[PDB]
Amino acid sequence: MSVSAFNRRWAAVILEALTRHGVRHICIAPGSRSTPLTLAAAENSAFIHHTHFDERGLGHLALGLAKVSKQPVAVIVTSGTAVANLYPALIEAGLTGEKLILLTADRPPELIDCGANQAIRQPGMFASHPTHSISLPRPTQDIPARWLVSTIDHALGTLHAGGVHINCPFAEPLYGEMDDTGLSWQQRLGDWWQDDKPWLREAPRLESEKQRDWFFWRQKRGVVVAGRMSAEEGKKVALWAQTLGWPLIGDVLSQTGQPLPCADLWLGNAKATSELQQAQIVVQLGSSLTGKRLLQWQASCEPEEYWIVDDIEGRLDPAHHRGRRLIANIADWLELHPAEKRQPWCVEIPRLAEQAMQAVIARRDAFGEAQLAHRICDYLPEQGQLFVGNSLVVRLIDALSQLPAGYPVYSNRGASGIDGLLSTAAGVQRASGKPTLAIVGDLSALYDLNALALLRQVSAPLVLIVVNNNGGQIFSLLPTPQSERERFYLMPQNVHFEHAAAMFELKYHRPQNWQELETAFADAWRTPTTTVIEMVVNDTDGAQTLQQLLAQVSHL
Amino acid sequence: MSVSAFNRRWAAVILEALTRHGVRHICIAPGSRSTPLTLAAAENSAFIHHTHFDERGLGHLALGLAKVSKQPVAVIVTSGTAVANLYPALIEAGLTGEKLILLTADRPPELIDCGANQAIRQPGMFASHPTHSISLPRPTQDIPARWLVSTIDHALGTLHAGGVHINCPFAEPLYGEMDDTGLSWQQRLGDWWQDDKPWLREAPRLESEKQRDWFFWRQKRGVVVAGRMSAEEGKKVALWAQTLGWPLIGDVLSQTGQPLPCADLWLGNAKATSELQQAQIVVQLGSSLTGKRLLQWQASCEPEEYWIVDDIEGRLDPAHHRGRRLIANIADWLELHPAEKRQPWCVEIPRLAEQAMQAVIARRDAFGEAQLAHRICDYLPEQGQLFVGNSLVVRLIDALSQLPAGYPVYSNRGASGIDGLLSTAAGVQRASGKPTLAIVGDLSALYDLNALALLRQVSAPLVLIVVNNNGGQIFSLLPTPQSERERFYLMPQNVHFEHAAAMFELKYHRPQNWQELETAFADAWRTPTTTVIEMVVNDTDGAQTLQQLLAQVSHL
Ligand SMILES: Cc1ncc(C[n+]2csc(CCOP(=O)(O)OP(=O)(O)O)c2C)c(N)n1
Ligand SMILES: Cc1ncc(C[n+]2csc(CCOP(=O)(O)OP(=O)(O)O)c2C)c(N)n1
Ligand SMILES: [Cl-]
Ligand SMILES: [Cl-]
Ligand SMILES: [Cl-]
Ligand SMILES: [Cl-]
Ligand SMILES: [Cl-]
Ligand SMILES: [Cl-]
Ligand SMILES: [Cl-]
Ligand SMILES: [Mn+2]
Ligand SMILES: [Mn+2]
């Protein structure tokens, strides 16, 4: 008889099913309509439970979790605009591949389009952005549990990457006594409840075949571009490229070690671009390439074929080159297409890359964001991970430093949003347990401000560098019109973060030089908490230093 | 020739066209892709420009503006998750009628699903939540300006209520000199550029017909239920119900003056409900009724007829009574269905309503949220406006105080989200220019924390009361389960707002008695600046006081 009790039994099947697909982490926002989902999750000891009050934050927390653990991470939210806040993190997931299982509570069909409070049209509301969309029916004992677990099984079994959105109508009485309504119904699943596999096993592998002409292509004048990939993938790619004798352009996100550093600088030099005109094939592994000069070279170069090896799906070359798009695990792929010993063919690029770095070393003293980015390894935590925020920071680290091979870097570099960086960071460190360094801009920090709440619960030191250049200074770098740049572009907020840290009880440091920055780090890494280091810098110095260094290099 | 210059030409046609439909406020977030729209907006002298860095807050700021002004308000954002953030405000607008014109910038078609940075598929991404979706084509001179303005003219001309999503591909060379490409193409529109009406006027009106059996019905035992309507409509409805001799159950949002106050209390009393069983007809004006007892009585009652009169569309009875759904401006409808002076048929309800308010007044003294709610009248600015947050506050002011007839009230009571209350308040005050009192919960305040940024800029004094009962205390009033309530429901963040206030250079108080609250307000209505008043209150007291007042009143 009890609707209250049955809703929970319905929800218990949902959650148990996700358990069979490697879902450990679950992110929960407060609600009433979500009561069946939340209580089922709460009482299921397979989960590690995370909670937060801002649903946009909640999505990004889940996104950081899935980013690092490579596992499907679940999200429970209540009906209404709560669901709509998951949209940004879902979008990023859909572009970078994080498996997010969004379980969104709903009013039941009777309470739709009739002025019911906090009742909206939720089925379909993320359009094409989920990989799978399940819109569950009203819960009824007339639909057997086997269908409910099968539906979920298929969605998860076949999920290569990106998000699944499972809309969960519940009618209400939501609370009440657990009388054993639906226990019978649940029992038709038999000992599946004691099993560790899913009910229906459906896991087709999606993968491109061996390139049988690889033995031919591996001998051409090639170039290796390396975008976003795993830390270990980064090392493998470096040795591979080296063996071929092909120049490797490694992104900040590559973790290759960057044997030809300051690509964003040297690629702007005619000697480099014309040397590369000799490249017969370009093999790019991973994507989301950072620098302007890399994108621009890429968009303009004309090899015989262009390859992109990556674990995600769909076309990845925005310049649409003739070539191949190869779906694979990068490490697997490298083993399936091993490098072969060849003499290098580049003469000028190794030279320019060295000079480029030197021009930057020559500028390392000024206490500016350009320099912080140059010097950033100095500050990497031992056995840690770097989280790079968006806008100027990622561009400057990519252009001016040479990150160590196999040192973990993480970013939200799919949609490049500045909406969820702090909570994504929270996820990232939570996932792995590692000491974590996260560097972010001032608007970025202002955007995801309340995420500082999550930053009270960290398992290893997290250092949050907020670079404060009073506004979105990237729009200084781009050729924006002078007269409406302050108001409509930069949007300085004229604020500091001392009071932010105070509010949430985090250590704060506002260093005036390098000696003070190192002493802030020394204290920070001592304790499994989050320290906020505000780096206040002159608004336009970073962008100008980049432009100058670009110009300098382009004359060498 | 110049794509740059034409992007801007195209955009200015769009923005100019909005001009002819009373769009005067415009809300801009920072970005590169949105350049054509933003620059066109900036140079167009019709618009009052508003800016913010958080796009979710931006949407809600526009919601605020559109709410008060009852004009269409435009929003510009850039491509990527920026767009996705408009969702919450858009869902709200869709339910309550605010006219939000979302001009969302987008990459051109060549750059979608090809690994291009910050490119996602936007056309259709709000599903069916917009009233119209204009998905614009790639800008070209081969499509006449008369098409562009006409498409915008149609969507805006026909717009009864809710948002229009206008997606705007712009191909890049976004910056460049402003040569005279597409001037010739603009001129094909002739002297329309000096006109003040639309190019295509298509403005059909949507109305219900005169109810020609009204003279029959107005003599039966009727009940007037009044929900969200304008402040002038509240006064009229009070005059009307009084004349007919029908009891008026009036919501916080109604501005009717509430002449049977504390309905949430007296509707729980059996004598009141049985007297209401004699109701032959129920005429509700407006919608989104607040309280449980009203929502519950409304659900259960069985009058021969049930009428809902509101200028929004669709069904508004979540109990789906046999009756009438009349789409009309309330002020107009009342004139078209005038009252006739008649002897009030209710006997005990007035007595119960008085005794209920007395029960409440007898409890005014304790320094807590329930008591703040009850006496909020005392703090209302002269010639000002109220903005009520969600959760416990709106429930408490509806239950425990009697707001003045005609004194303007506003809320986000469609989807009842807690995600945009401060930024909505901002736009609410900005639209009217009136001194504003806005009260909100702690988690509410945290959710929209960065909106404190906008509150630095206020055309009249704004007081923001933040009730801090350490968590979502509504889940203390709802019969949620014991051992998982704090963690999965209330989610206390153990925090204050002194520092938040400080960060954003806003005056802060934290009164500890009625006197200290009076001193906080002495200063608060003089200067056109924002004052934060944090009300620290025992977590659980509000909920229990309501519960007790409920129990006390049912015994009358
Ligand atoms: C959600 C979202 N909105 C807007 C943008 C456009 N955008 C890119 S960078 C930027 C400004 C970043 O400001 P800040 O954190 O101060 O970084 P800085 O420009 O100084 O590197 C904006 C608004 C975006 N990427 N994501
Ligand atoms: C965007 C959104 N997420 C979640 C909810 C569900 N919800 C309704 S009330 C509430 C708690 C509000 O807490 P607070 O601001 O402290 O007010 P209090 O409960 O103490 O009145 C929540 C989470 C919602 N309405 N909107
Ligand atoms: Cl809820
Ligand atoms: Cl159904
Ligand atoms: Cl960026
Ligand atoms: Cl700390
Ligand atoms: Cl942009
Ligand atoms: Cl609410
Ligand atoms: Cl100042
Ligand atoms: Mn900045
Ligand atoms: Mn609260």
Side-chain angles (χ1 to χ4, degrees), chain B residues 361-384:
Chain B
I361 291 170
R363 283 254 232 168
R364 48 174 270 117
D365 287 311
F367 192 72
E369 62 179 314
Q371 285 79 7
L372 213 218
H374 160 82
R375 35 212 279 192
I376 199 73
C377 268
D378 288 6
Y379 312 90
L380 298 190
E382 229 137 54
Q383 294 292 278

PDB file of all heavy atoms in Angstrom, chain B residues 361-384:
ATOM      1  N   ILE B 361       0.632  37.550  17.868  1.00  0.00           N
ATOM      2  CA  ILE B 361       1.101  38.767  18.535  1.00  0.00           C
ATOM      3  C   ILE B 361       1.564  38.485  19.976  1.00  0.00           C
ATOM      4  O   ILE B 361       2.588  39.022  20.420  1.00  0.00           O
ATOM      5  CB  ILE B 361       0.040  39.884  18.478  1.00  0.00           C
ATOM      6  CG1 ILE B 361      -0.104  40.372  17.023  1.00  0.00           C
ATOM      7  CG2 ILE B 361       0.396  41.026  19.432  1.00  0.00           C
ATOM      8  CD1 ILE B 361      -1.286  41.315  16.757  1.00  0.00           C
ATOM      9  N   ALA B 362       0.833  37.621  20.684  1.00  0.00           N
ATOM     10  CA  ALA B 362       1.196  37.213  22.057  1.00  0.00           C
ATOM     11  C   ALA B 362       2.608  36.599  22.156  1.00  0.00           C
ATOM     12  O   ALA B 362       3.140  36.373  23.252  1.00  0.00           O
ATOM     13  CB  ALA B 362       0.144  36.247  22.619  1.00  0.00           C
ATOM     14  N   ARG B 363       3.205  36.358  20.993  1.00  0.00           N
ATOM     15  CA  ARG B 363       4.480  35.683  20.878  1.00  0.00           C
ATOM     16  C   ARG B 363       5.510  36.530  20.148  1.00  0.00           C
ATOM     17  O   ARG B 363       6.521  36.013  19.698  1.00  0.00           O
ATOM     18  CB  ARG B 363       4.268  34.398  20.100  1.00  0.00           C
ATOM     19  CG  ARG B 363       3.640  33.291  20.885  1.00  0.00           C
ATOM     20  CD  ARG B 363       4.692  32.290  21.193  1.00  0.00           C
ATOM     21  NE  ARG B 363       4.246  30.972  20.789  1.00  0.00           N
ATOM     22  CZ  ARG B 363       5.028  29.903  20.723  1.00  0.00           C
ATOM     23  NH1 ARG B 363       6.320  29.986  21.025  1.00  0.00           N
ATOM     24  NH2 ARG B 363       4.505  28.745  20.350  1.00  0.00           N
ATOM     25  N   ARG B 364       5.257  37.828  20.038  1.00  0.00           N
ATOM     26  CA  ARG B 364       6.110  38.699  19.240  1.00  0.00           C
ATOM     27  C   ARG B 364       7.493  38.939  19.821  1.00  0.00           C
ATOM     28  O   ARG B 364       8.410  39.279  19.080  1.00  0.00           O
ATOM     29  CB  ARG B 364       5.431  40.046  18.937  1.00  0.00           C
ATOM     30  CG  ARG B 364       4.799  40.756  20.115  1.00  0.00           C
ATOM     31  CD  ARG B 364       4.290  42.133  19.722  1.00  0.00           C
ATOM     32  NE  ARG B 364       5.336  43.139  19.905  1.00  0.00           N
ATOM     33  CZ  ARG B 364       5.881  43.865  18.934  1.00  0.00           C
ATOM     34  NH1 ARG B 364       5.468  43.736  17.667  1.00  0.00           N
ATOM     35  NH2 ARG B 364       6.839  44.734  19.236  1.00  0.00           N
ATOM     36  N   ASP B 365       7.647  38.724  21.127  1.00  0.00           N
ATOM     37  CA  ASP B 365       8.815  39.202  21.872  1.00  0.00           C
ATOM     38  C   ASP B 365      10.134  38.474  21.746  1.00  0.00           C
ATOM     39  O   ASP B 365      11.172  39.126  21.700  1.00  0.00           O
ATOM     40  CB  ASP B 365       8.472  39.358  23.328  1.00  0.00           C
ATOM     41  CG  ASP B 365       7.591  40.534  23.556  1.00  0.00           C
ATOM     42  OD1 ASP B 365       7.919  41.635  23.038  1.00  0.00           O
ATOM     43  OD2 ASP B 365       6.554  40.351  24.231  1.00  0.00           O
ATOM     44  N   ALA B 366      10.112  37.142  21.725  1.00  0.00           N
ATOM     45  CA  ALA B 366      11.348  36.379  21.525  1.00  0.00           C
ATOM     46  C   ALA B 366      12.145  36.897  20.303  1.00  0.00           C
ATOM     47  O   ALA B 366      11.566  37.233  19.264  1.00  0.00           O
ATOM     48  CB  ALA B 366      11.036  34.917  21.397  1.00  0.00           C
ATOM     49  N   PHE B 367      13.465  36.998  20.440  1.00  0.00           N
ATOM     50  CA  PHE B 367      14.273  37.548  19.365  1.00  0.00           C
ATOM     51  C   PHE B 367      14.669  36.437  18.408  1.00  0.00           C
ATOM     52  O   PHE B 367      15.761  35.891  18.497  1.00  0.00           O
ATOM     53  CB  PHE B 367      15.501  38.285  19.913  1.00  0.00           C
ATOM     54  CG  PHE B 367      16.230  39.112  18.887  1.00  0.00           C
ATOM     55  CD1 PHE B 367      15.678  40.302  18.405  1.00  0.00           C
ATOM     56  CD2 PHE B 367      17.473  38.709  18.404  1.00  0.00           C
ATOM     57  CE1 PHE B 367      16.352  41.067  17.440  1.00  0.00           C
ATOM     58  CE2 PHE B 367      18.160  39.470  17.444  1.00  0.00           C
ATOM     59  CZ  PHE B 367      17.602  40.646  16.965  1.00  0.00           C
ATOM     60  N   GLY B 368      13.765  36.100  17.492  1.00  0.00           N
ATOM     61  CA  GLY B 368      13.998  35.022  16.538  1.00  0.00           C
ATOM     62  C   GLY B 368      13.249  35.235  15.240  1.00  0.00           C
ATOM     63  O   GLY B 368      12.411  36.139  15.151  1.00  0.00           O
ATOM     64  N   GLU B 369      13.542  34.381  14.250  1.00  0.00           N
ATOM     65  CA  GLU B 369      13.047  34.539  12.877  1.00  0.00           C
ATOM     66  C   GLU B 369      11.526  34.579  12.764  1.00  0.00           C
ATOM     67  O   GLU B 369      10.990  35.443  12.061  1.00  0.00           O
ATOM     68  CB  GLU B 369      13.645  33.481  11.934  1.00  0.00           C
ATOM     69  CG  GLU B 369      13.308  32.013  12.252  1.00  0.00           C
ATOM     70  CD  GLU B 369      13.915  31.025  11.259  1.00  0.00           C
ATOM     71  OE1 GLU B 369      13.825  31.272  10.039  1.00  0.00           O
ATOM     72  OE2 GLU B 369      14.486  30.005  11.699  1.00  0.00           O
ATOM     73  N   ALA B 370      10.835  33.678  13.466  1.00  0.00           N
ATOM     74  CA  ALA B 370       9.373  33.686  13.453  1.00  0.00           C
ATOM     75  C   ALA B 370       8.847  35.082  13.783  1.00  0.00           C
ATOM     76  O   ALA B 370       7.895  35.566  13.166  1.00  0.00           O
ATOM     77  CB  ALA B 370       8.829  32.672  14.427  1.00  0.00           C
ATOM     78  N   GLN B 371       9.498  35.724  14.752  1.00  0.00           N
ATOM     79  CA  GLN B 371       9.100  37.037  15.231  1.00  0.00           C
ATOM     80  C   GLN B 371       9.501  38.136  14.266  1.00  0.00           C
ATOM     81  O   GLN B 371       8.746  39.083  14.085  1.00  0.00           O
ATOM     82  CB  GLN B 371       9.651  37.309  16.633  1.00  0.00           C
ATOM     83  CG  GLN B 371       8.927  36.561  17.747  1.00  0.00           C
ATOM     84  CD  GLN B 371       9.341  35.108  17.872  1.00  0.00           C
ATOM     85  OE1 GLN B 371      10.273  34.649  17.206  1.00  0.00           O
ATOM     86  NE2 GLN B 371       8.648  34.372  18.729  1.00  0.00           N
ATOM     87  N   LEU B 372      10.674  38.017  13.646  1.00  0.00           N
ATOM     88  CA  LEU B 372      11.051  38.912  12.552  1.00  0.00           C
ATOM     89  C   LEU B 372       9.979  38.896  11.466  1.00  0.00           C
ATOM     90  O   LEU B 372       9.502  39.961  11.043  1.00  0.00           O
ATOM     91  CB  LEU B 372      12.366  38.480  11.920  1.00  0.00           C
ATOM     92  CG  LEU B 372      13.304  39.561  11.368  1.00  0.00           C
ATOM     93  CD1 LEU B 372      13.950  39.063  10.089  1.00  0.00           C
ATOM     94  CD2 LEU B 372      12.652  40.934  11.180  1.00  0.00           C
ATOM     95  N   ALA B 373       9.609  37.681  11.028  1.00  0.00           N
ATOM     96  CA  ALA B 373       8.595  37.484   9.994  1.00  0.00           C
ATOM     97  C   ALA B 373       7.352  38.247  10.362  1.00  0.00           C
ATOM     98  O   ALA B 373       6.872  39.068   9.580  1.00  0.00           O
ATOM     99  CB  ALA B 373       8.269  36.014   9.827  1.00  0.00           C
ATOM    100  N   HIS B 374       6.860  37.998  11.575  1.00  0.00           N
ATOM    101  CA  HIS B 374       5.610  38.576  12.045  1.00  0.00           C
ATOM    102  C   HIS B 374       5.602  40.101  12.069  1.00  0.00           C
ATOM    103  O   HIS B 374       4.562  40.723  11.838  1.00  0.00           O
ATOM    104  CB  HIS B 374       5.280  38.047  13.428  1.00  0.00           C
ATOM    105  CG  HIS B 374       4.319  38.908  14.172  1.00  0.00           C
ATOM    106  ND1 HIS B 374       2.959  38.839  13.975  1.00  0.00           N
ATOM    107  CD2 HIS B 374       4.517  39.885  15.088  1.00  0.00           C
ATOM    108  CE1 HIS B 374       2.357  39.718  14.757  1.00  0.00           C
ATOM    109  NE2 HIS B 374       3.281  40.369  15.439  1.00  0.00           N
ATOM    110  N   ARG B 375       6.751  40.704  12.364  1.00  0.00           N
ATOM    111  CA  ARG B 375       6.823  42.160  12.482  1.00  0.00           C
ATOM    112  C   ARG B 375       7.587  42.856  11.353  1.00  0.00           C
ATOM    113  O   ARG B 375       7.876  44.050  11.453  1.00  0.00           O
ATOM    114  CB  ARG B 375       7.329  42.590  13.873  1.00  0.00           C
ATOM    115  CG  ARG B 375       8.358  41.667  14.495  1.00  0.00           C
ATOM    116  CD  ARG B 375       8.256  41.620  16.029  1.00  0.00           C
ATOM    117  NE  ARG B 375       8.916  42.773  16.651  1.00  0.00           N
ATOM    118  CZ  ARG B 375       9.196  42.891  17.944  1.00  0.00           C
ATOM    119  NH1 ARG B 375       8.884  41.928  18.791  1.00  0.00           N
ATOM    120  NH2 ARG B 375       9.789  43.983  18.387  1.00  0.00           N
ATOM    121  N   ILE B 376       7.875  42.127  10.273  1.00  0.00           N
ATOM    122  CA  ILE B 376       8.590  42.696   9.131  1.00  0.00           C
ATOM    123  C   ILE B 376       7.975  44.025   8.673  1.00  0.00           C
ATOM    124  O   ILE B 376       8.671  44.888   8.137  1.00  0.00           O
ATOM    125  CB  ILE B 376       8.719  41.690   7.940  1.00  0.00           C
ATOM    126  CG1 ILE B 376       9.847  42.112   6.979  1.00  0.00           C
ATOM    127  CG2 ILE B 376       7.387  41.498   7.200  1.00  0.00           C
ATOM    128  CD1 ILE B 376      11.250  41.880   7.522  1.00  0.00           C
ATOM    129  N   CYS B 377       6.674  44.182   8.906  1.00  0.00           N
ATOM    130  CA  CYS B 377       5.976  45.437   8.641  1.00  0.00           C
ATOM    131  C   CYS B 377       6.694  46.651   9.184  1.00  0.00           C
ATOM    132  O   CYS B 377       6.727  47.694   8.529  1.00  0.00           O
ATOM    133  CB  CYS B 377       4.592  45.400   9.246  1.00  0.00           C
ATOM    134  SG  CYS B 377       3.435  44.819   8.063  1.00  0.00           S
ATOM    135  N   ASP B 378       7.258  46.492  10.382  1.00  0.00           N
ATOM    136  CA  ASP B 378       7.946  47.553  11.106  1.00  0.00           C
ATOM    137  C   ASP B 378       9.162  48.090  10.380  1.00  0.00           C
ATOM    138  O   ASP B 378       9.586  49.216  10.633  1.00  0.00           O
ATOM    139  CB  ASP B 378       8.366  47.060  12.492  1.00  0.00           C
ATOM    140  CG  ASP B 378       7.191  46.903  13.434  1.00  0.00           C
ATOM    141  OD1 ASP B 378       6.030  47.068  12.985  1.00  0.00           O
ATOM    142  OD2 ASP B 378       7.433  46.626  14.627  1.00  0.00           O
ATOM    143  N   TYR B 379       9.713  47.293   9.471  1.00  0.00           N
ATOM    144  CA  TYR B 379      10.969  47.644   8.830  1.00  0.00           C
ATOM    145  C   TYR B 379      10.826  48.006   7.364  1.00  0.00           C
ATOM    146  O   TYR B 379      11.820  48.351   6.714  1.00  0.00           O
ATOM    147  CB  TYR B 379      11.972  46.523   9.042  1.00  0.00           C
ATOM    148  CG  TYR B 379      12.001  46.090  10.482  1.00  0.00           C
ATOM    149  CD1 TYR B 379      11.158  45.078  10.940  1.00  0.00           C
ATOM    150  CD2 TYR B 379      12.840  46.724  11.402  1.00  0.00           C
ATOM    151  CE1 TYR B 379      11.174  44.691  12.270  1.00  0.00           C
ATOM    152  CE2 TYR B 379      12.868  46.348  12.731  1.00  0.00           C
ATOM    153  CZ  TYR B 379      12.034  45.330  13.162  1.00  0.00           C
ATOM    154  OH  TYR B 379      12.051  44.952  14.481  1.00  0.00           O
ATOM    155  N   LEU B 380       9.590  47.950   6.857  1.00  0.00           N
ATOM    156  CA  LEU B 380       9.302  48.250   5.458  1.00  0.00           C
ATOM    157  C   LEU B 380       9.549  49.719   5.129  1.00  0.00           C
ATOM    158  O   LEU B 380       8.960  50.588   5.757  1.00  0.00           O
ATOM    159  CB  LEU B 380       7.861  47.880   5.104  1.00  0.00           C
ATOM    160  CG  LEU B 380       7.404  46.428   5.218  1.00  0.00           C
ATOM    161  CD1 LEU B 380       6.039  46.315   4.573  1.00  0.00           C
ATOM    162  CD2 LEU B 380       8.384  45.486   4.550  1.00  0.00           C
ATOM    163  N   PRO B 381      10.419  49.995   4.135  1.00  0.00           N
ATOM    164  CA  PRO B 381      10.710  51.368   3.738  1.00  0.00           C
ATOM    165  C   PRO B 381       9.497  52.099   3.164  1.00  0.00           C
ATOM    166  O   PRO B 381       8.713  51.521   2.406  1.00  0.00           O
ATOM    167  CB  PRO B 381      11.793  51.203   2.673  1.00  0.00           C
ATOM    168  CG  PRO B 381      11.592  49.855   2.153  1.00  0.00           C
ATOM    169  CD  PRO B 381      11.187  49.036   3.328  1.00  0.00           C
ATOM    170  N   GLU B 382       9.365  53.370   3.540  1.00  0.00           N
ATOM    171  CA  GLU B 382       8.298  54.241   3.056  1.00  0.00           C
ATOM    172  C   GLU B 382       8.445  54.421   1.554  1.00  0.00           C
ATOM    173  O   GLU B 382       9.509  54.805   1.072  1.00  0.00           O
ATOM    174  CB  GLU B 382       8.388  55.598   3.756  1.00  0.00           C
ATOM    175  CG  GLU B 382       7.087  56.119   4.335  1.00  0.00           C
ATOM    176  CD  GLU B 382       7.291  56.722   5.731  1.00  0.00           C
ATOM    177  OE1 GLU B 382       8.161  57.623   5.885  1.00  0.00           O
ATOM    178  OE2 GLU B 382       6.583  56.290   6.680  1.00  0.00           O
ATOM    179  N   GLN B 383       7.370  54.142   0.825  1.00  0.00           N
ATOM    180  CA  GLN B 383       7.367  54.203  -0.640  1.00  0.00           C
ATOM    181  C   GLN B 383       8.344  53.211  -1.253  1.00  0.00           C
ATOM    182  O   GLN B 383       8.877  53.446  -2.339  1.00  0.00           O
ATOM    183  CB  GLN B 383       7.661  55.624  -1.143  1.00  0.00           C
ATOM    184  CG  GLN B 383       6.593  56.650  -0.794  1.00  0.00           C
ATOM    185  CD  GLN B 383       5.286  56.410  -1.539  1.00  0.00           C
ATOM    186  OE1 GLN B 383       5.139  56.810  -2.701  1.00  0.00           O
ATOM    187  NE2 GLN B 383       4.326  55.760  -0.871  1.00  0.00           N
ATOM    188  N   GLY B 384       8.562  52.099  -0.552  1.00  0.00           N
ATOM    189  CA  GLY B 384       9.544  51.094  -0.966  1.00  0.00           C
ATOM    190  C   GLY B 384       8.965  49.819  -1.557  1.00  0.00           C
ATOM    191  O   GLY B 384       7.907  49.839  -2.187  1.00  0.00           O
TER     192      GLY B 384
END
